[PDB]
Amino acid sequence: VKQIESKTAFQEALDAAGDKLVVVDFSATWCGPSKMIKPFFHSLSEKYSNVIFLEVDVDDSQDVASESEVKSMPTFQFFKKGQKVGEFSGANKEKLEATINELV
Ligand SMILES: [Cl-]
Ligand SMILES: [Cl-]
Ligand SMILES: [Cl-]
Ligand SMILES: [Cl-]
């Protein structure tokens, strides 16, 4: 999992994923559900080696969370070729797995 820290480093890793799906975990260290799903998000990134996993810590990078309109954590946003295709909020491991498999 790549940690994302600015509006430009976000702009950039999207440009770079090529065709791969990109999943973005918006998390906080003080958020119980974010902490719970953190190592699961990491473990998925060991598995879906053809999917790009990024994390935005909303305290570290509030301007990125603000651009992304993220105020509840954890929120997962999904991007394909530069574009946001879907999102959801909550530490829902089944939904996370299912969505990764759904999105083309
Ligand atoms: Cl919380
Ligand atoms: Cl929260
Ligand atoms: Cl919460
Ligand atoms: Cl279910």
From Swiss-Prot:
What residues make up the catalytic site? C31, S34
Identify the PROSITE patterns for this entry: THIOREDOXIN_1, THIOREDOXIN_2
Question: Quick one: effect of changing E69A?
Answer: Strongly reduced interaction with CASP3
Alphabetical list of Pfam families matching this protein: Thioredoxin
User: Boundaries of each Thioredoxin domain copy?
Assistant: 1-104
Q: Which residues carry this modification: S-nitrosocysteine?
A: S61, S68, S72
Q: What is its main location?
A: nucleus
A cellular component annotation (GO) from this entry: cytosol
* Residue list for modification N6-succinyllysine: K7, K93
User: What molecular functions are annotated in GO for this chain?
Assistant: protein homodimerization activity; protein-disulfide reductase [NAD(P)H] activity; protein-disulfide reductase activity; RNA binding; thioredoxin-disulfide reductase (NADPH) activity
Deprotonates C-terminal active site Cys (site feature) positions: D25
Localization in the cell = Nucleus; Cytoplasm; Secreted
Explain the post-translational modification.
In case of infection, ubiquitinated by S.typhimurium protein slrP, leading to its degradation.
Indicate yes or no for the key word Transport. Answer: yes
**Keyword DNA-binding found:** no
Explain what induces or represses this protein's expression: Up-regulated by ionizing radiation.
- The signal peptide stretch is none
Which processes are annotated in GO (biological process)? cell redox homeostasis; cellular detoxification of hydrogen peroxide; negative regulation of protein export from nucleus; negative regulation of transcription by RNA polymerase II; positive regulation of DNA binding; positive regulation of peptidyl-cysteine S-nitrosylation; positive regulation of phosphatidylinositol 3-kinase/protein kinase B signal transduction; response to nitric oxide
What UniProt keywords are attached to this protein's entry? Acetylation, Activator, Allergen, Cytoplasm, Disulfide bond, Electron transport, Nucleus, Redox-active center, S-nitrosylation, Secreted, Transcription, Transcription regulation, Transport, Ubl conjugation
Give the family this protein belongs to, as stated in its UniProt record.
Belongs to the thioredoxin family.
Protein function: Participates in various redox reactions through the reversible oxidation of its active center dithiol to a disulfide and catalyzes dithiol-disulfide exchange reactions. Plays a role in the reversible S-nitrosylation of cysteine residues in target proteins, and thereby contributes to the response to intracellular nitric oxide. Nitrosylates the active site Cys of CASP3 in response to nitric oxide (NO), and thereby inhibits caspase-3 activity.
Q: Subunit details for this protein?
A: Homodimer; disulfide-linked. Interacts with TXNIP through the redox-active site. Interacts with MAP3K5 and CASP3. In case of infection, interacts with S.typhimurium protein slrP. Interacts with APEX1; the interaction stimulates the FOS/JUN AP-1 DNA-binding activity in a redox-dependent manner.
Protein name in UniProt: Thioredoxin
Q: Which organism is it from?
A: Homo sapiens
